[PDB]
Amino acid sequence: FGQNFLNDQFVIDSIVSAINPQKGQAMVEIGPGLAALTEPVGERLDQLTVIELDRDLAARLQTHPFLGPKLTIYQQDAMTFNFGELAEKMGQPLRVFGNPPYNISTPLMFHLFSYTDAIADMHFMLQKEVVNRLVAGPNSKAYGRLSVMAQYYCNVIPVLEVPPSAFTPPPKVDSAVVRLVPHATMPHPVKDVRVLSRITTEAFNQRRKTIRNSLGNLFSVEVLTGMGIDPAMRAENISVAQYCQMANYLAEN
Ligand SMILES: [Cl-]
Ligand SMILES: [Cl-]
């Protein structure tokens, strides 16, 4: 449980103009809620898809006077949803947007990243501290596994800052809308993304320990220094490119 609904008309119109929905596109809203974004987005379209977990909230959109005829509604967890299959059915990549429940906001990005070409872009309302993590550069408390994985997959652009008073009820923290665009060309292509995922996982479990300590399991001291990496570095010190280099190393050797 845990839902906060956008109430601010001027913020909503900002988010909507930021998303810039256009007829012909395959928009998919996650957590439409009380139709705060769904209404104004819907008005611009002839067809819309929404995934809403709450049984009552999904039922209400079904009988909405204007949205009703335009909507395909999936009453379920967005985590269990095959977006690739939808993009296949739609015949084009999806523009996913909305306000995912906090409890799945991190896993859903990962889920969505794996469909790669099936997603045109994403506009999400998320906790501020998560937006900080997504866009974080090295040498920061916010820089972590998520930073590296998201930046591997996507251009990450913070779009709008949203204070709690634009929600009923207000949340305990600040929020931000973030745009994520899967890379047309991978800046740091990686032969096996599973390896990058693993390196980052094991690296960031031991943030304080040095890369030499934290992943002496996977790389010898010579391998790291042969890559230009200082073994005395902690996980926060290693650039996104460097992580991708290490992943490419293990896959090729
Ligand atoms: Cl309503
Ligand atoms: Cl992290």
Sheet holding 26-30, edge to edge: 71-74, 48-51, 26-30, 94-98, 119-127, 175-182, 154-162
Q: Which residues contact 230 (CB under 8 A, 6 or more apart)?
A: 237
Ligand nearest to the CA of 148: 2
How do 48-51 and 71-74 pair as beta strands? Answer: parallel
- Is residue 228 annotated as involved in ligand binding? no
> Binding site annotation covers 117?
no
CATH topology of domain 187-253: Helicase, Ruva Protein; domain 3 (1.10.8)
Q: Would you tell me the crossing angle of helices 193-205 and 145-153 to the nearest 10 degrees?
A: 160
Residue 56 CB: number of other CB atoms within 10 A?
7
Q: Using the mean position of ligand 2's atoms as its centre, give its distance from the Cα of residue 130 in Å.
A: 9
Alpha helices in 63-210 (DSSP H): 83-90, 102-113, 128-135, 145-153, 193-205
CA–centroid distance, residue 15 to ligand 1 (Å): 19
Inter-residue contact 132 to 142 (CB < 8 Å): yes
Q: Residue 5: beta bridge partners?
A: 168
Nearest bound ligand to the CA of residue 150: 2
Q: Which ligand is nearest to the CA of 67?
A: 1
188 contact partners, CB below 8 Å, separation of at least 6: 152, 240, 241, 244, 245
What are 175's two structure tokens? 């929020």
Q: How was this structure determined?
A: X-ray
Rounded distance from Cα 65 to ligand 2 centre (Å): 43
Q: From ligand 1's centre to the CA of 121, what distance in Å? A: 27
Residue 4 annotated as binding site: yes
Strands 48-51 and 26-30: parallel
Ligand at minimal distance from the CA of 61 is 1
- What's the 65 CA to ligand 1 centre distance in angstroms? 10
What is the CA(21)–ligand 2 centre distance, in A?
32
Cα 34 to averaged position of ligand 1 atoms, centre (Å): 6
Structure tokens at 120: 């045109």
CATH 3.40.50.150 fits 1-186, yes or no: yes
Tokens of 90: 């739609």
Domain boundaries, the chain: 1-186, 187-253
Give the closest ligand to the alpha carbon of residue 57. Answer: 1
Cα 51 to averaged position of ligand 2 atoms, centre (Å): 27
Exposure of 86 by Cβ count < 10 A (0-12 exposed, 13-18 middle, 19+ buried)?
A: buried
Question: Contact at 8 Å (CB) between 30 and 73?
Answer: no
